[PDB]
Amino acid sequence: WQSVQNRTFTKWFNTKLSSRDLPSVFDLRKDLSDGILLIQLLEIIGDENLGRYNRNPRMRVHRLENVNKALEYIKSKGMPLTNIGPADIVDGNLKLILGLIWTLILRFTIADINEEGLTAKEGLLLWCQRKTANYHPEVDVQDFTRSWTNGLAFCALIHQHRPDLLDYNKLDKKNHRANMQLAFDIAQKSIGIPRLIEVEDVCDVDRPDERSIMTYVAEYFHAFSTLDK
Ligand SMILES: [Zn+2]
Ligand SMILES: [Zn+2]
Ligand SMILES: [Zn+2]
């Protein structure tokens, strides 16, 4: 069994790796232990060549070397590695691994988001608010949790960007699950937005995972913005 955040972060990681036909992550407890996929991820999201590393790290010393290379790169970019060391990754500390991946999502997916001079999380929230301004009172984006669980904010974002793809006014606003599914399907099929979260992970969830939602909503910002150039 894997948590929403585990699954969402794994899917995010894989969208990056697949951009270079690299092998996927299936289990974050085990699949980062030799340091290779972490290094490759960093090259991809960081747009840099990290140079040579151990490509057959059969011995523990070489896995630690690989992971240490990754962590040093992350530190060199000014990201906090609060209370994580190479052995935490080699030995599959899932809590610390998810923490690290969030640090990377925040830096490489969210930090550069900008709306009205606000950046990062604030910027992304404000973008959502501005883009859904015409959908009050039923849509009211106030956070990256409860504001998203009825499906309508996702549908409104799609509709305002491409009113030909999703007829918002024809939705049965009470069918949260059908509307969520519709948005996720249209986003993926027509807008190229990867399905980082399952409908059941957010639809009518009392305490949805904030970081997972943020990770997925950031895909809307980047795709919409790029497509609107
Ligand atoms: Zn747009
Ligand atoms: Zn509650
Ligand atoms: Zn969270």
- Whole-number Å distance, alpha carbon 90 to ligand 3 midpoint, is 24
- The amino acid sitting at 157 is L
Range(s) for CATH 1.10.418.10 in the chain? 1-113, 114-229
List of residues 6+ apart from 135 with CB closer than 8 A: 152, 153, 156, 160, 168
User: What is the token pair recorded at 175?
Assistant: 């069918």
Measure the CA–CA gap between 212 and 14, rounded to whole angstroms: 15
When the candidates are 1.10.418.10, 3.40.640.10, 3.30.70.860, 3.40.390.10, the CATH number that belongs to 114-229 is 1.10.418.10
- Whole-number Å distance, alpha carbon 62 to ligand 3 midpoint, is 32
Measure the CA–CA gap between 213 and 211, rounded to whole angstroms: 5
List of residues 6+ apart from 100 with CB closer than 8 A: 74, 81, 84, 89
Measure the CA–CA gap between 92 and 30, rounded to whole angstroms: 6
Query: At 115, which helix (H) or strand (E)?
Result: strand 114-115
User: What is the token pair recorded at 14?
Assistant: 């894989």
- Whole-number Å distance, alpha carbon 59 to ligand 1 midpoint, is 50
* Resolution, Å (one decimal): 1.5
Residue 182's φ and ψ, nearest 5 degrees, are -55, -50
- Whole-number Å distance, alpha carbon 224 to ligand 1 midpoint, is 5
Measure the CA–CA gap between 4 and 18, rounded to whole angstroms: 21
Measure the CA–CA gap between 93 and 46, rounded to whole angstroms: 24
Residue 120 backbone zone (phi > 0: left; psi -120 to 50: alpha; other: beta) = left
Strand-pair partners of 119 = 114
| CATH 1.10.418.10 fits domain 1-113 | yes
- Whole-number Å distance, alpha carbon 29 to ligand 1 midpoint, is 38
Nearest ligand, measured from the Cα of 210: 3
Experimentally, the structure was elucidated by X-ray
- The radius of gyration of the chain's CA atoms, rounded to the nearest angstrom, is 19
- Whole-number Å distance, alpha carbon 209 to ligand 2 midpoint, is 13
- Whole-number Å distance, alpha carbon 155 to ligand 3 midpoint, is 22
Nearest ligand, measured from the Cα of 149: 2
- Whole-number Å distance, alpha carbon 211 to ligand 2 midpoint, is 18
